[PDB]
Design a binder for this molecule. Structure first.
Ligand SMILES: *[C@@H]1O[C@H](CO)[C@@H](O[C@@H]2O[C@H](CO)[C@@H](O[C@@H]3O[C@H](CO[C@H]4O[C@H](CO[C@H]5O[C@H](CO)[C@@H](O)[C@H](O)[C@@H]5O[C@H]5O[C@H](CO)[C@@H](O)[C@H](O)[C@@H]5O)[C@@H](O)[C@H](O[C@H]5O[C@H](CO)[C@@H](O)[C@H](O)[C@@H]5O)[C@@H]4O)[C@@H](O)[C@H](O[C@H]4O[C@H](CO)[C@@H](O)[C@H](O)[C@@H]4O[C@H]4O[C@H](CO)[C@@H](O)[C@H](O)[C@@H]4O[C@H]4O[C@H](CO)[C@@H](O)[C@H](O)[C@@H]4O)[C@@H]3O)[C@H](O)[C@H]2NC(C)=O)[C@H](O)[C@H]1NC(C)=O
Ligand SMILES: *[C@@H]1O[C@H](CO)[C@@H](O[C@@H]2O[C@H](CO)[C@@H](O[C@@H]3O[C@H](CO)[C@@H](O)[C@H](O)[C@@H]3O)[C@H](O)[C@H]2NC(C)=O)[C@H](O)[C@H]1NC(C)=O
Ligand SMILES: *[C@@H]1O[C@H](CO)[C@@H](O[C@@H]2O[C@H](CO)[C@@H](O[C@@H]3O[C@H](CO)[C@@H](O)[C@H](O)[C@@H]3O)[C@H](O)[C@H]2NC(C)=O)[C@H](O)[C@H]1NC(C)=O
Ligand SMILES: *[C@@H]1O[C@H](CO)[C@@H](O[C@@H]2O[C@H](CO)[C@@H](O[C@@H]3O[C@H](CO)[C@@H](O)[C@H](O)[C@@H]3O)[C@H](O)[C@H]2NC(C)=O)[C@H](O)[C@H]1NC(C)=O
Ligand SMILES: *[C@@H]1O[C@H](CO)[C@@H](O[C@@H]2O[C@H](CO)[C@@H](O)[C@H](O)[C@H]2NC(C)=O)[C@H](O)[C@H]1NC(C)=O
Ligand SMILES: *[C@@H]1O[C@H](CO)[C@@H](O)[C@H](O)[C@H]1NC(C)=O
Length: 330
C-alpha cells in the first residue's frame, strides 16, 4: 500500500527540524568571556523590564557581598563581570558535531503566519529538492557556513540571536563579533569619544557616552572582622542602573560609541545532514519502526533528548558520533 504517507508523518513528527552539523575540524568557542552588550540586562534587583533572555543563564552577575579573598576568576574565569561567562561544556575541543532540533534557523520561506499545513509541505518539498541522500546541498546553507551557500533552507544568524539562542551562536557561528560599549574597547575612552565617533560634536541621556567605564582594579574590602561578608568593587561600572543601554544603542536609538571586533572561530565548510531525510531514506530499507527507534536513540546521544529541549535551546555538541546510526536487522 502507499506506505509513503505513514513514513512521512512519523519521520516528520519526530525529526522534522533535526539536523547534524559536522565541523571540518573540531573548533570550539575560543574565549571564556562573551561581550554581548546588545542584550538587555535584568537591571536593579532583577526587577526586569524585559522578558527573560536566555543568555542570562550565562550572566556574570555582580554581587555586592563576597568573601575576603574573592576574585571573579573563581567563578567566571577570564570573563568580565557584568558580561557573560561561557562554561567549559559549551567550548569543548572534543566536540566534532552539533546536533539541533529547532526551526529558528529557517529562511523566509518558513514563517509561522502560514498554516502549519503549508509549512510542513514546503519543508518536506525543499528538503527533498535540496538533499543528496541525507546531506544538504551547500546552496541550502548560509554562505558563511559553506562556499556556495544561498540560504535556500537556513537563514543567516544575526546579532540579536545570541540573546535568545545563545547555545546556537556559541556552537555554530563561524565568527565571533563583539558589540561593546565598554571603556577601552576599540581604544575608545571617556576622553576621546568626541573624536572617535564622527557624529559626536561634544537629547537622549544615553547619547555619545559609554555604558561601562573602568573604575579601577577589582577588589574586595572588609570593614568588619567578619571576613565572609565583605564589599566587592568591580573593575567596570555596574550596568543595573542602565540595564538596556547596549540594546538601545544597537537599535540606533541615539548616536554614540560602538565597538565591533571580529575573531575567526571556525574555518572551512560545514556539512549538514537532515535527520528527517535520513529517516525517510532508511525507512524504505530497514522499516519505519527500527529507523524511528535508532534515530530517537541518536537524538538521545548525550542522555538528554535534543528534540525534548526547548526550540530556542536545542543545540548540543557531540563527540565523534556515528551517523547514520546502526539500524536493527529485524
Ligand atoms: C554570529 O554570526 C552572525 C553572522 O555571521 C553575526 O551577525 C553579523 O554581525 C556583524 C557584526 O555585528 C554584522 O556586521 C556589521 O554590520 C554593521 C551594520 O551594517 C549596516 O550599517 C552600517 C552603518 O550604516 C551607516 O552608514 C550607512 C552608509 O554607509 C547609512 O546608510 C546608514 O543609515 C548608517 O548611517 C548612520 O545612521 C545610523 C542610525 O540610523 C547609525 O547607527 C550609523 O552608525 C551611522 O552613523 C553600514 O556601514 C553597513 O554597510 C554594509 O552594507 C553591506 C552589508 O550590509 C556591505 O555590502 C557593505 O560593504 C557594508 O559593510 C550596513 O548597511 C556595520 O556597522 C559593521 O561594520 C563594522 O564592523 C566590521 C567588522 O569588524 C568592520 O569591518 C567595519 O568596518 C565596521 O567596523 C568599524 O566600525 C566598528 C563599529 O561599528 C568599530 O568598532 C571598528 O573598529 C570599525 O571602525 C573603524 O572603521 C570605521 C569605518 O566603518 C571608521 O569610521 C572608524 O573611525 C574606525 O576607523 C558590521 O559590518 C553583520 O551584519 C551580522 N550579520 C547578520 C546576518 O546579521 C553575529 O554578530 C555573530 N554573533 C556573535 C555573538 O558572535
Ligand atoms: C576530551 O576527552 C578526554 C578523553 O575522554 C577527556 O579526558 C578525560 O576526562 C575524564 C573526566 O571528564 C577523566 O576521567 C577521570 O579519570 C580519573 C583518573 O585520574 C578517574 O579516577 C575518574 O573517575 C574519571 O573517570 C579522564 O581521566 C580524562 N582522560 C584523559 C586521557 O585526559 C577530556 O577532559 C575532554 N576534554 C574536555 C574539554 O572535555
Ligand atoms: C546572508 O549573508 C551573505 C553573506 O555571506 C549575504 O550574501 C551577500 O549578499 C549581497 C546582497 O544580496 C551580495 O552583494 C551584491 O552583489 C551583487 C553582484 O551582482 C551586486 O549587484 C549588489 O549591489 C551587491 O553588492 C553579496 O555578493 C553576497 N555575498 C555572498 C558571499 O554571497 C546574504 O545577502 C545574506 N542574507 C541575508 C538575508 O542577510
Ligand atoms: C537517554 O539515555 C539515558 C541514559 O544515559 C536514559 O536515562 C535512563 O533512564 C532510565 C529511565 O528511568 C533509568 O532507568 C532506571 O534507573 C533507576 C535509577 O538508576 C533504576 O533503579 C531503575 O531500575 C531503572 O533502570 C536509567 O537509570 C537512566 N540512565 C542514566 C544513565 O541516567 C534516558 O531514559 C534516555 N532517554 C530516552 C528518551 O530514551
Ligand atoms: C528546487 O527545484 C527546482 C526545480 O524546478 C530547481 O531549479 C529551478 O528550476 C526552475 C525551472 O524548472 C527555474 O526556473 C528555477 O529558477 C530553479 N530554482 C532556482 C532556485 O533557481 C531548484 O534548484 C531546486 N532547489 C531549490 C532550493 O529551490
Ligand atoms: C588600538 O590601539 C592599538 C595600539 O595601542 C592597535 O594595535 C589597535 O589596532 C587599535 N585598535 C583600533 C580599533 O584602533
Amino acid at each position: 500500500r502507499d506506505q509513503e504517507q505513514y513514513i512521512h508523518r512519523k519521520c516528520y513528527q519526530e525529526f522534522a527540524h533535526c539536523y547534524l552539523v559536522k565541523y571540518k575540524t573540531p573548533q570550539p568557542w575560543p574565549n571564556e568571556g562573551l561581550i554581548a552588550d546588545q542584550c538587555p540586562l535584568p537591571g536593579l534587583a532583577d526587577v526586569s523590564f524585559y522578558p527573560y533572555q536566555a543568555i542570562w543563564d550565562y550572566y556574570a552577575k555582580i554581587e555586592n557581598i563576597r568573601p575576603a579573598n574573592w576574585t571573579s576568576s573563581k567563578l567566571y574565569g577570564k570573563a568580565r563581570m557584568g558580561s557573560y561567562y561561557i562554561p567549559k561544556r559549551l567550548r569543548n575541543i572534543n566536540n566534532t558535531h552539533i546536533l539541533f532540533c529547532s526551526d529558528v534557523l529557517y529562511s523566509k520561506w518558513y514563517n509561522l503566519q502560514n498554516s502549519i499545513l503549508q509549512n510542513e509541505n514546503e519543508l518536506t518539498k525543499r528538503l527533498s529538492n535540496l538533499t543528496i541522500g541525507n546531506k544538504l546541498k551547500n546552496r541550502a546553507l548560509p554562505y558563511e557556513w559553506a562556499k556556495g551557500g544561498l540560504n535556500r533552507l537556513f537563514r543567516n544568524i544575526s546579532v540579536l540571536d545570541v540573546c535568545s539562542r545563545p547555545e546556537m551562536v556559541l556552537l555554530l557561528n563561524k565568527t565571533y563579533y563583539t558589540f561593546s560599549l565598554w571603556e577601552g574597547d576599540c581604544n575608545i575612552t571617556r576622553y576621546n569619544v568626541n573624536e572617535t565617533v564622527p557624529e559626536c560634536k561634544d537629547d537622549h541621556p544615553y547619547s555619545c557616552r559609554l555604558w561601562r567605564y573602568r573604575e579601577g582594579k577589582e577588589e574586595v574590602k572588609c570593614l568588619t572582622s567578619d571576613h565572609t561578608r565583605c564589599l566587592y568593587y568591580p573593575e567596570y561600572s555596574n550596568p543595573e542602573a542602565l540595564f538596556d543601554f547596549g540594546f538601545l544603542s544597537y537599535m540606533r536609538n541615539f548616536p554614540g560609541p560602538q565597538c565591533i571586533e571580529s575573531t575567526s572561530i571556525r574555518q572551512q565548510d560545514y556539512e549538514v545532514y537532515s535527520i528527517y531525510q535520513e529517516c525517510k531514506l532508511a525507512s524504505k530499507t530497514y522499516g519505519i519502526d527500527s529507523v524511528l527507534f535508532s534515530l530517537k536513540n541518536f537524538l538521545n546521544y548525550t542522555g538528554k533528548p535534543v528534540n525534548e529541549m526547548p526550540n530556542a535551546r536545542a543545540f548540543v555538541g557531540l563527540i565523534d558520533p556515528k551517523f547514520p546510526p546502526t539500524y536493527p536487522d529485524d
